[PDB]
């Protein structure tokens, strides 16, 4: 938009008295429609680039920029060397300098952002006037101080700087948008740059020297275009409400911002919440009563880390955290003991130099029992706390509909792909029930998801190989929902041998008929049945520590094997092979050997130590030993 400036003086009179001195007749000029003047906003921004000192700036992140010296004074020699004339200015630095300029940028970023593009050019010419680039230096403000949602969009926030973080599902193709028009005369040679601002189409009927109507043909092959990438984004899963589906806002990206945000990441979108009337007919100027809400995209503390390190040295942290996942059942701690190590998994390693690049270090736990007795709380509690959890139904959803399938789409004239549920929870945890009565076609597609970590689907002329991987848990059930001592554990599980062998541990919900067994289970649920909320926050820690305990070791401590603690894995592998009695000479595959290494990496990750000793190795084989006696 190119708006004019209207002076705010008395119409019809030049100056009513007031000699020499300037009383109420100074610089009252301002843009008509905005309380931001170019002659006033530019002067307030030049001092922001010269008189701004941030002593609290770090050195590992601001390499090349001095801390004591002004930061923006050293950035003059950085824009002309990176190639692209686009300066990255953080909105947090503006509030710490002037509070008046910070409120004018967010309230109306339509004329303040273009004003900043002309102030940097004046300072850049006073330092390196010889170094030139493509077009001019533009300012891309990002990282605001507002965190709202699509439902809290007040009607007073129209055409303002709103920053809402989310997750991008999929992106569109490339839609060229012709900006400046280009024409060529059919008689002479003359170029004309017609500004097609505000979505207007017009062509001049008078040439340069020919001066003949209908003699200047249009050529749309030498003008400047711009790709229009339609990016969709909804509410972030970490701050979304429960009980309703989130709203998706359409995002636009032009210039160099096209193909920058990959679909499937969590990038803070900083744009301007604008609104344009939908044009029904491109010929006749029609205005729709329902506008289109579009947003033009522009671009831990130390009080909690020290508390997590003190608990790592305590030898009781592994027992306190394992009992926090049992809010009702007192016993049966060995069932949920392996679930705590599932969120950690282990540090993923790369071996592309030997022909084996992809490798997953996640732990897959296998459960079995009655779906409702003791498994009703272990399927809905790991979904509300963990933000990377995706719940889905087995029988309610199709086999190919859960993953990434192919579906017709006559809108884009291309057989595009669609997302699912487990393909979005990468590096997290997937939630899925009903594994004993699941579909036959669904069991077949799981032979390469959690095994090969590469979903290769080549059908209907669609060559696509997905690289999504996520630890999936299961909860089986016998043919009679009860253990039968007359038959072995092999006949009870109806799953084939190739399916149960891909899982690590194995447990089973047993209900003994002992009289003394109810003395330690029935006397516990009644004690907490009449008690309200006068003991939950007194004898048990809060849930705010568990969410912050796993968000630190997953990107700081990378444990690895050594030379002494790794020798115990060979001797323990030979002893667990000649089992017999139950099934026979089995367990002769590198499956249980690979899963045993994942158990040692998960135990050392909770202890906050990259060095793995022989203590954590003895604890890995102890969990596998209890799984054998449970199913026998």
């Amino acid at each position: 938009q190119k708006g004019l400036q209207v002076d705010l003086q008395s119409d019809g009179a030049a100056a009513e008295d007031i000699v020499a001195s300037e009383q109420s007749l100074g610089q009252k000029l301002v843009i008509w429609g905005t309380d931001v003047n170019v002659a006033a906003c530019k002067e307030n921004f030049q001092r922001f680039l010269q008189r701004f000192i941030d002593p609290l700036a770090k050195e590992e992140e601001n390499v090349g920029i001095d801390i004591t010296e002004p930061l923006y004074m050293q950035r003059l020699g950085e824009i002309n060397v990176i190639g692209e004339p686009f300066l990255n200015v953080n909105c947090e630095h503006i509030k710490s300098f002037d509070k008046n300029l910070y409120r004018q940028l967010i309230s109306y970023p339509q004329e303040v952002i273009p004003t900043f593009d002309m102030a940097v050019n004046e300072i850049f010419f006073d330092r390196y006037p010889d170094s030139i680039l493509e077009h001019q230096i533009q300012v891309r403000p990002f990282n605001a101080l507002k965190t709202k949602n699509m439902r809290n969009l007040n009607p007073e926030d129209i055409d303002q700087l709103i920053t809402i973080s989310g997750m991008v599902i999929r992106t569109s193709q490339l839609i060229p948008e012709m900006q400046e028009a280009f024409f060529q005369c059919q008689v002479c040679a003359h170029t004309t740059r017609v500004e097609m601002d505000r979505g207007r189409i017009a062509e001049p009927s008078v040439c340069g020297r020919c001066h003949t109507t209908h003699s200047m043909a249009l050529i749309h092959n030498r003008s400047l275009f711009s790709d229009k990438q339609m990016i969709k984004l909804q509410e972030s899963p970490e701050d979304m409400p429960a009980g309703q589906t989130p709203h998706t806002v359409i995002l636009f990206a032009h210039n160099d911002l096209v193909d920058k945000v990959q679909p499937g990441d969590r990038v803070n979108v900083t744009g301007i919440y604008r609104a344009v009337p939908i044009r029904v007919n491109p010929r006749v100027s029609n205005v729709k009563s329902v506008y289109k809400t579009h947003i033009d995209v522009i671009h831990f503390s130390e009080k909690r880390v020290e508390l997590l390190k003190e608990l790592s040295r305590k030898p009781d942290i592994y027992e306190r955290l394992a009992s926090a996942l049992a809010p009702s059942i007192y016993e049966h701690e060995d069932i949920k003991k392996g679930i705590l190590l599932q969120l950690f998994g282990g540090t993923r390693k790369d071996f592309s130099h030997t022909g084996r690049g992809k490798f997953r270090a996640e732990i897959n736990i296998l459960l079995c029992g009655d779906p409702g007795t003791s498994k009703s709380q272990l399927l809905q509690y790991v979904y509300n706390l963990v933000p990377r959890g995706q719940y889905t139904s087995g029988k309610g959803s199709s086999a190919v509909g859960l993953t990434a399938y192919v579906m017709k789409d006559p809108e884009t004239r291309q057989l595009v792909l669609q997302t699912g549920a487990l393909v979005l929870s990468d590096n997290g945890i997937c939630c899925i029930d009903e594994f004993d009565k699941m579909n036959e076609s669904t069991r077949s597609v799981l032979h390469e998801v959690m095994e090969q970590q590469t979903l290769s689907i080549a059908k209907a002329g669609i060559i696509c190989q997905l690289n999504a991987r996520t630890s999936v848990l299961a909860a089986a059930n016998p043919i009679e929902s009860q253990w039968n001592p007359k038959k072995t554990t092999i006949e009870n599980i109806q799953l084939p041998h190739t399916l149960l062998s891909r899982f690590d541990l194995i447990f089973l919900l047993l209900d003994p008929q002992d009289e003394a067994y109810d003395r330690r289970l029935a006397h516990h649920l009644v004690a907490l049945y009449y008690q309200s909320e006068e003991q939950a926050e007194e004898e048990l820690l809060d849930m705010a520590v568990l969410k912050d305990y796993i968000a630190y070791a997953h990107s700081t401590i990378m444990p690895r094997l050594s030379e002494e603690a790794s020798q115990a894995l060979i001797e323990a592998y030979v002893d667990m092979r000649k089992i017999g009695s139950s099934r026979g000479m089995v367990s002769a595959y590198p499956r249980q050997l690979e899963s045993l290494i994942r158990l040692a990496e998960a135990h050392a990750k909770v202890r906050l130590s990259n060095k793995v000793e022989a203590i954590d190795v003895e604890e890995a084989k102890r969990l596998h030993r209890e799984a054998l006696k449970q199913s026998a």
Partner: protein, 120 residues
């Protein structure tokens, strides 16, 4: 019973009762009386209509561009009495959704897209 949801989790509640009997032993007297007795209880039986219109009725709303899923006996009977006859005659898909709406009374809908939790 008690509906306070302590210790983070949610305890059980709502009285449950099952009855087996041939539909014809004056069962309508025990059903029509309890239907008008409870303020939030609609007269729904096992027959009279299709099985995909009383517990899983999908309505394709093309006026707004969404996808909803309603029932007929467990979507509008909050803190009331759910009246239904012939508990063992429908398909297995209709009896699977009862595993979560009966214990803690939480409607779980997850058919690839519809991600919501109804409270009834």
């Amino acid at each position: 019973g008690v509906d306070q949801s302590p210790r983070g989790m949610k305890i059980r509640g709502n009285i449950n009762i099952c009855l087996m009997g041939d539909p014809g032993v004056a069962k309508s007297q025990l059903l029509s009386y309890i239907d008008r007795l409870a303020p939030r209880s609609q007269y729904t039986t096992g027959r009279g209509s299709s099985g995909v219109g009383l517990t899983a009725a999908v309505l394709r709303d093309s006026v707004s561009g969404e996808l909803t899923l309603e029932g007929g006996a467990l979507v509008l009977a909050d803190q009331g009495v759910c009246c239904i006859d012939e508990f063992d005659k429908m398909a297995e898909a209709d009896r699977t959704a009862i595993h979560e709406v009966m214990e803690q009374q939480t409607i779980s809908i997850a058919k690839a897209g519809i991600l919501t939790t109804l409270n009834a």
